Design a protein around this ligand. Structure first.
Ligand SMILES: *[C@@H]1O[C@H](CO)[C@@H](O[C@@H]2O[C@H](CO)[C@@H](O[C@@H]3O[C@H](CO)[C@@H](O)[C@H](O)[C@@H]3O)[C@H](O)[C@H]2NC(C)=O)[C@H](O)[C@H]1NC(C)=O
Ligand SMILES: CC(C)CCC[C@@H](C)[C@H]1CC[C@H]2[C@@H]3CC=C4C[C@@H](OC(=O)CCC(=O)O)CC[C@]4(C)[C@H]3CC[C@]12C
Ligand SMILES: CC(C)CCC[C@@H](C)[C@H]1CC[C@H]2[C@@H]3CC=C4C[C@@H](OC(=O)CCC(=O)O)CC[C@]4(C)[C@H]3CC[C@]12C
Ligand SMILES: CC(C)CCC[C@@H](C)[C@H]1CC[C@H]2[C@@H]3CC=C4C[C@@H](OC(=O)CCC(=O)O)CC[C@]4(C)[C@H]3CC[C@]12C
Ligand SMILES: CC(C)CCC[C@@H](C)[C@H]1CC[C@H]2[C@@H]3CC=C4C[C@@H](OC(=O)CCC(=O)O)CC[C@]4(C)[C@H]3CC[C@]12C
Ligand SMILES: CC(C)CCC[C@@H](C)[C@H]1CC[C@H]2[C@@H]3CC=C4C[C@@H](OC(=O)CCC(=O)O)CC[C@]4(C)[C@H]3CC[C@]12C
Ligand SMILES: CC(C)CCC[C@@H](C)[C@H]1CC[C@H]2[C@@H]3CC=C4C[C@@H](OC(=O)CCC(=O)O)CC[C@]4(C)[C@H]3CC[C@]12C
Ligand SMILES: CC(C)CCC[C@@H](C)[C@H]1CC[C@H]2[C@@H]3CC=C4C[C@@H](OC(=O)CCC(=O)O)CC[C@]4(C)[C@H]3CC[C@]12C
Ligand SMILES: CC(C)CCC[C@@H](C)[C@H]1CC[C@H]2[C@@H]3CC=C4C[C@@H](OC(=O)CCC(=O)O)CC[C@]4(C)[C@H]3CC[C@]12C
Ligand SMILES: CC(C)CCC[C@@H](C)[C@H]1CC[C@H]2[C@@H]3CC=C4C[C@@H](OC(=O)CCC(=O)O)CC[C@]4(C)[C@H]3CC[C@]12C
Lengths: 91, 226, 140, 112, 102
């Protein structure tokens, strides 16, 4: 039900990723440049998911609860899986 | 060095650092074979005056095996002998040419598999029941925007080449696949309001089409370059 | 200053290939402007979704413009690509201002927002097409 | 920066009932201004001594920070007395732009 | 090893100017900390507002620290600005955990 808070947090995180990128590109495709973009991909996909939640909130009320139930436990799984895929190739 | 001999055979040696320039075709980047060369010739003496010839053709050039570039690998080198004609006369020439090949394994993981994973992820949308619209609309939007961002940043990270490449072709292909999947569901949404039979029909039809089409595209792509 | 010299002049003619800058910056900007149309066709109640949409378009436009003007030197006058970028930019921010004012007007009366969308959906794409018509015809 | 300051001004008209919206706005303006400053400090030529554009950006940062503190004060003091906040809103709406324009007039008279 | 050689010496003294770094990093830190201490005067019932308020201060601290630490030249030990940035960066976590336990 808190409409402005979630959108503000999403926009803020996206801008922070923008600044972190534009700082990091300056300091082929290096291994360090790959990891920094998947951060952006996740933190943008989350805001897109909440956009979908607010759009399809009216038709299926029980779906949004199920959507949070999936996401809360799947985002950490995906992030740990990406960390596993990334750092094993490093060593 | 200067080394004389009892029969008058002089021997002149130098130690040179040349920043030579070779032309690189990058239409097949990054799955390409480079032919960089080094051309040597006399300058003031015509072919009626001086003669060049490699001494010990088998052992003319040494130490190539120990060469190890950080990104390429020396496949093979060949030797040439020619006579070139300019406006002033006929001058002799010798050539040294060795192929260059890239290490594809360093680029596969870093470039290709993100788009592959996104394309495969776009397939899971079909397995969800067509009643749940949000679960598929979210996947479609997320996959399209993710392909957009990966394409943009991967294009920016690659070195600056002002003409078309092949990795761009593959990225365009994957983008077309995911965008057509999104439009596929966007049309199924419109036709489902009219009638559910046609909607479920086209859904299962695309389900049985797309994997075969994608595998065919990848096979056609990888057989022609490798 | 000294005297009359003699000068030999040679002109090497050159032409820039356009095959790259089409699929590099012009075609992505056209695709992003056309994509920005989806915001209008969405429901007028959903604020967060269309805000995400607009933020996406804005970020892509800015990151495109940075490199587009970086590849080219810094001259006083405006190039024939600055105008195209500025038209992309004006259309996307006009759509953003339209969304911003609809988000305020839809509360008092829904018919106002409905009519605004019904007008914009045909107004914006036709204008962008007419602008492409005016642009690409002259230079060739 | 002028756009960010005007957007920070936009928050005053909003009713005090929906406080979360104006809180989100007063926060987003601050962080957007900080990010704009940090991004602008790269493309400019790297010179390690004070410029005028930096003083200008810091001035705008001070403006938005003062606006957010003002709203925090209004939100805390309202529950005891409503007329205080109902006056402060209408006085701030007209005092922020005046001070901002006066500061800009002084700046552009002295550095042009 | 060869012998005793005469050697003239000259020392030039230098002192870094701080005026730029005052308006560059330190003052944004102080502003961000003062802003993060504002949360206590918000209402305890409006939970999401306070949560966003606390998180965005940490976001600002991260952006500011990344922007500031880039110009520092590489050294083995820790510079004297690093301690200030670390404390300025830990107080916001303190305030956030305080809000959490409240
Ligand atoms: C890189 O490109 C150059 C340019 O083509 C390659 O040089 C070419 O090498 C082939 C054989 O190595 C030459 O063919 C020869 O032609 C003479 C003509 O009489 C013939 O007598 C020989 O038996 C042989 O067939 C070809 O002329 C030569 N091209 C030029 C312009 O000199 C080079 O081989 C390439 N690099 C590698 C690693 O292959
Ligand atoms: C990008 C991948 C990694 C995490 C995945 C998400 C994990 C959880 C959800 C919630 C689920 O409801 C819809 C799919 C979605 C958005 C997934 C979409 C594809 C995502 C964003
Ligand atoms: C990343 C992979 C690993 C687990 C996968 C998820 C497994 C379960 C689901 C629930 C399903 O409904 C939607 C796809 C999704 C999010 C998958 C999206 C792609 C994920 C997140
Ligand atoms: C897109 C951002 C930039 C300006 C923001 C707007 C600034 C002012 C308002 C008025 C406010 O009332 C509702 C949020 C809104 C539309 C914001 C929605 C998100 C917007 C459109
Ligand atoms: C903001 C305040 C604090 C410092 C003040 C500045 C102090 C020094 C000068 C130089 C002076 O010349 C013009 C006024 C100015 C810019 C002041 C403008 C108003 C400023 C920027
Ligand atoms: C300029 C900033 C710094 C001090 C701020 C003032 C602090 C106190 C008040 C009193 C308050 O009543 C109205 C806002 C105002 C004028 C603020 C307007 C914006 C000001 C002038
Ligand atoms: C919107 C109205 C209500 C208050 C008016 C403002 C009252 C005070 C000023 C300061 C004045 O200087 C310029 C006009 C302005 C911005 C007015 C512009 C039109 C405003 C913003
Ligand atoms: C805001 C005022 C109060 C303290 C003032 C600062 C006091 C000390 C300095 C250091 C000086 O160097 C530049 C001006 C500045 C930033 C002043 C700018 C205007 C400030 C930040
Ligand atoms: C924040 C205030 C409180 C202490 C002030 C500082 C006190 C001492 C100095 C050293 C002086 O040299 C420059 C101003 C400065 C940084 C002041 C800047 C503004 C500061 C940091
Ligand atoms: C990690 C810290 C930083 C933000 C904190 C969160 C801020 C907001 C909330 C919501 C609140 O309800 C429960 C505590 C929690 C998860 C906090 C848990 C501890 C967190 C995640």
């Amino acid at each position: 039900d808190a409409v402005p808070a979630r959108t503000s947090l999403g926009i803020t995180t996206v801008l922070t990723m923008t600044t972190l990128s534009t700082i990091a590109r300056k300091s082929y495709v290096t291994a360090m440049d790959l990891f920094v973009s998947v951060c952006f991909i996740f933190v943008f996909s989350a805001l897109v998911e909440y956009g979908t939640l607010h759009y399809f909130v009216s038709s299926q009320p029980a779906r949004a609860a199920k959507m949070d139930s999936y996401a809360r436990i799947f985002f950490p799984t995906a992030f740990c899986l990406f960390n596993l895929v990334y750092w094993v190739s490093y060593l | 060095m200067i080394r004389l001999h009892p029969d008058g055979t002089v021997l002149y040696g130098l130690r040179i650092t040349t920043t030579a320039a070779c032309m690189m075709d990058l239409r097949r980047y990054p799955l390409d074979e480079q032919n960089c060369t080094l051309e040597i010739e006399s300058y003031g003496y015509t072919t009626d005056d001086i003669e060049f010839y490699w001494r010990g053709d088998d052992n003319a050039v040494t130490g190539v095996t120990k060469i190890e570039l950080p990104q390429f690998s020396i496949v093979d080198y060949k030797l040439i002998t020619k006579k070139v004609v300019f406006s002033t006369g006929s001058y002799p020439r010798l050539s040294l040419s060795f192929k260059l090949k890239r290490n594809i394994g360093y680029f596969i993981l870093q470039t290709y598999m993100p788009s592959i994973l996104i394309t495969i992820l776009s397939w899971v949308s079909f397995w969800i029941n067509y009643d749940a619209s949000a679960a598929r609309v979210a996947l479609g939007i997320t996959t399209v925007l993710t392909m957009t961002t990966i394409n943009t940043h991967l294009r920016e990270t690659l070195p600056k080449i002002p003409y078309v490449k092949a990795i761009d072709m593959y990225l365009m292909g994957c983008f077309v696949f995911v965008f057509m999947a999104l439009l596929e569901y966007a049309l199924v949404n419109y036709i489902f309001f009219s009638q559910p039979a046609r909607a479920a029909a086209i859904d299962r039809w695309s389900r049985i089409f797309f994997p075969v089409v994608f595998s065919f595209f990848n096979i056609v792509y990888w057989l022609y370059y490798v | 200053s000294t005297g009359e010299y003699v000068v030999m002049t040679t002109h090497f003619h050159l032409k820039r290939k356009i095959g790259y800058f089409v699929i590099q910056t012009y075609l992505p900007c056209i695709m992003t402007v056309i994509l920005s149309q989806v915001s209008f066709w969405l429901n007028r109640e959903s604020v967060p979704a269309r805000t995400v949409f607009g933020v996406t378009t804005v970020l892509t436009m800015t990151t495109l413009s940075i490199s587009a003007r970086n590849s080219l030197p810094k001259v006083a006058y405006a190039t024939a690509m600055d105008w195209f970028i500025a038209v992309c930019y004006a259309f996307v921010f006009s759509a953003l201002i339209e969304f911003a004012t609809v988000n305020y007007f839809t509360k008092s009366q829904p018919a106002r927002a409905a009519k605004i969308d019904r007008l914009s959906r045909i107004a914006f794409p036709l204008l962008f097409g007419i602008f492409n018509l005016v642009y690409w015809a002259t230079y060739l």
